Amino acid sequence: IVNGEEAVPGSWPWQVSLQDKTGFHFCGGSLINENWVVTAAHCGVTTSDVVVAGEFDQGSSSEKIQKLKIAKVFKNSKYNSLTINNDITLLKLSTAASFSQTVSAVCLPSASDDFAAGTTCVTTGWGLTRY
Amino acid sequence: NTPDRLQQASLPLLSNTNCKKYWGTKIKDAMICAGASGVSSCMGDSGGPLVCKKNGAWTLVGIVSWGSSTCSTSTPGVYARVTALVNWVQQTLAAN
């Protein structure tokens, strides 16, 4: 995030980090329950990648994080790689996340929910702060 | 080089009609734009959440998808519109 700010540790409990086997963070994701994570289909997640929950500082070795294995990758059948439309993938975890003060789920909206232009929302992540 | 600590940013949602002034026909119905306000999602944020507070609870409205190749803060980022994808999410969870 460019021009964002540091978050209060653990204040976005559903935010997970998707890392490859080398420990490299390549995408974010959100826990929707103990066994499922929602992410972008274009992230190209495989069962070799790891979901890291409860993390704030990726440079810290003292955080009680949860490294969860992925059982199956469910890419939305309507995903169009050419236009990047319907960019969503569900990841079913091999081992359920353990909810705590720093690990919990985000709510999902109803298909008819209305979120008006002008409404101020929030986005989070460990993406580039400067390009 | 991604930051060590988790970042956050508040930003406004745009209508797809106004977002089209920036992105043209690349904006589809299953997309929702936000930003062009001095902040921007960027490489590495992909897959992450865009949440809005509804009735006191944070709700997943978008999934970071794509945007400016230079993460310009005066251009809106594009997110996967969750309301258009939630029925698939629920069918998937119910059958697995």
Partner: peptide
């Protein structure tokens, strides 16, 4: 210019 995130 556009780009994936």
């Amino acid at each position: 210019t556009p780009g994936v995130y």
